[PDB]
Amino acid sequence: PTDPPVYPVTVPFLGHIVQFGKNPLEFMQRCKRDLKSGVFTISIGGQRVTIVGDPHEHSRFFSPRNEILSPREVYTIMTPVFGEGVAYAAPYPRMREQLNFLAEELTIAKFQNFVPAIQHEVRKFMAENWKEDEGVINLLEDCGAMIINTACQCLFGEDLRKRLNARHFAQLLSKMESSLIPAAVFMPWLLRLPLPQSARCREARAELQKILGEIIVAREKEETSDLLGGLLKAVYRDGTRMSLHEVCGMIVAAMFAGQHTSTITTSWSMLHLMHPKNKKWLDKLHKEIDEFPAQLNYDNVMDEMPFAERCVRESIRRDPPLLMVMRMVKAEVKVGSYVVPKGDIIACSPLLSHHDEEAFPNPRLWDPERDEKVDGAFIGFGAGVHKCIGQKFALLQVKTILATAFREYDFQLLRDEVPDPDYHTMVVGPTLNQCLVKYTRKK
Ligand code: HEM
Ligand SMILES: O=C(N[C@H](Cc1c[nH]c2ccccc12)C(=O)Nc1ccncc1)c1ccc(N2CCN(c3ccc(Cl)cc3)CC2)cc1F
Ligand SMILES: [Cl-]
Structure with missing residues (x-):
């Protein structure tokens, strides 16, 4: 019957842009509390956004089919990045074919050699950059470098990596990313505003696709199982091969998303683990990794690091990098006693649901041993048909990096407290200038 309650608006043009922009964790909890409803509506620039902040109603977000709750419309800003006809921009069944082919390239079947590849690259990094017996580094920056270097080592064959190294790939991604206006998800008119300098997303994407095209021509001529090679075997149900434009787009989605x-996630994990109050947890991590060989394998990381995975999960739980998952409502959906109407953006919020007192009591405490107290309350990687396809790969990366780094080094935060989350970037992470850390090589 009933519309969800709307948080009062004092300035119509902006709606709640000020309070939601400045501090989304505070603002979302305050609406939930003061309006006395887990499901509620805010305005971003006049656009209604209905938030399903009751974890007992998560499935009313994650379960409806695409023609009822549609991701396409929220993600049209990505069209220049992934490409026209790619991913969200494809008809829904074709989108699903595409994402499923990419998912297959990121399953456990592909991981046999990943751990040595990740480990070797991480050691290379620490050997080049953490040389002395001790030094000060920005941990957020170094983790970033390690994530892209390790992912390329895992996913791209040597011929690719010779035309497109990790630094070159990073720069191309950065140009595609710096073009985006995150808020245009709600206010597409922002696209009309002038830029400080010309965007380079079209260029960067075309340069990537051109390089892949050349790699393929050269491979056709010599004769296979890197990410690219895999995607090139994909054949849709209609009998057509995934095109070079589509393959490029999937590869961009892969690298961009992670x-x-x-x-x-890596950075938060280390930041908690190195803080003095969490000595008991770092001691546990050492119990679990200390009898590992120097050359880790699949079994060590997949099967024998459950504590470290808990540490990683709990870091996403407390401070999820994606605060909101969103859909356009194409036809009304019932959620509890409310009805959410056509034209709303509906959202399920990992930030909010992960701070629900019932599902996660004392939510600002980092407790790797906690379990959700409401089934499905943890939505850091989403849920249902659209759940994260990179999650097993990402965990494999993060866990391998933790096992490798903390084996050879001790770390300490320069400041007194784990960093504040910086809510000012679309992917939210620890405040960059609060992330200075002193490493000390173990004796
Ligand atoms: C800790 C790291 C990551 C987190 C926290 C994360 C989070 C999420 C979330 C919350 C969703 C659901 C989005 C939605 O329902 O609309 C999702 C979907 C997705 N993620 Fe990730 N993700 C991570 C890593 C990765 C990586 C490494 C990839 C690499 C390919 C990736 C690719 C995707 C894809 C393709 C989907 C879309 C699935 C779909 O719409 O069906 N993610 N991720
Ligand atoms: O990180 C974001 N998106 C990118 C887009 C993207 C890359 N690869 C993908 C695969 C599948 C689906 C999406 C993507 C992204 O990296 N998403 C992502 C990463 C890992 N797994 C899944 C998704 C992102 C994150 C937040 C955001 N917002 C939320 C906040 N927002 C907002 C907040 C406050 C105010 Cl006042 C105004 C607007 C505007 C839109 C928009 C975004 F595009
Ligand atoms: Cl395009």
Whole structure:
């Protein structure tokens, strides 16, 4: 019957842009509390956004089919990045074919050699950059570098990596990313505003696709199982091969999706583990990794690091890098006693749901041993048909980096407290200038 309650608006043009922009964790909890409803509506620039902040109603967000709750419309800003006809921009069944092919390239079947590849690259990094017996580094920056270097080592064959190294790939991604206006998800008119300098997303994407095209021509001529090689075997149900434009787009989705999420997750994990109050947890991590061989394998990381995975999960739980998952409502959906109407953006919020007192009591405490107290309350990687396809790969990366770094080094935060989350970037992570850390090589 009933519309969800709307948080009062004092300035119509902006709606709640000020309070939601400045501090989304505070503002979302305050609406939930003061309006006395887990499901509620805010305005971003006049656009209604209805938030399903009751974890007992998570499935009313994650379960409806695409023609009812549609991701396409929220993600049209990505069209220049992934490409026209790619991913969200494809008809829904074709989108699903595409994402499923990419998912297959990121399953456990592909991981046999990943751990040595990740480990070797991480050691290379520490050997080049953490040389002395002790030194000061920015941990957020170094994790970033390690994430992209390790992902390329895993996913791209040597011929590719010779035309497109990690630094070159990073720069191309950065140009595609710096073009985006995150808020245009709600206010597409922002696209009309002038830029400080010309965007370079079209250029960067075309340069990538051109390089892949050349790699393929050269491979056709010599004769296979890197990410690219895999995607080139994909054949849709209609009998057509995934095109070079589509393959490029999937590869971009892969690298783009993991570069900040995984970096941030790595960084938070280390930041907690190195803080003095969490000595008991770092001691546990050492119990679990200390009998590992110098050359880790699949079994060590997949099967024998459950504590470290808990540490990683709890870091995403407390400070999820994606605060909101969103859909356009194409037809009304019932959620509890409310009805959410056509034209709303509906959202399920990992930031909010992960701070629900019932599901996660004392939510600002980092407790790797906690379990959700409401089934499905943890939505850091989403849920249902659209759940994260990179999650097993990302965990494999993060856990391998933790096992490798803390084996050879001790770390200490320069400041007194784990960093504040910086809510000012679309992928939210620890405040960059609060992330200075002193490493000390173990004797
Ligand atoms: C810790 C790291 C990561 C986090 C926290 C994260 C989070 C999420 C979330 C919350 C979703 C659901 C989005 C939605 O329902 O609309 C998701 C979907 C997705 N993620 Fe990730 N992700 C991570 C790493 C990765 C990586 C490494 C990839 C690499 C390919 C990736 C690719 C995707 C894809 C393709 C989907 C879309 C699935 C779909 O719409 O069906 N993610 N991720
Ligand atoms: O990080 C974001 N998006 C990118 C887009 C993207 C890359 N690869 C993908 C694969 C599948 C789906 C999406 C993507 C992204 O990296 N997403 C992502 C990463 C890992 N797994 C899944 C997704 C992102 C994150 C937040 C955001 N917002 C939320 C906040 N917002 C907002 C907040 C406050 C105010 Cl006042 C105004 C606007 C505008 C839109 C928009 C975004 F595009
Ligand atoms: Cl395009």
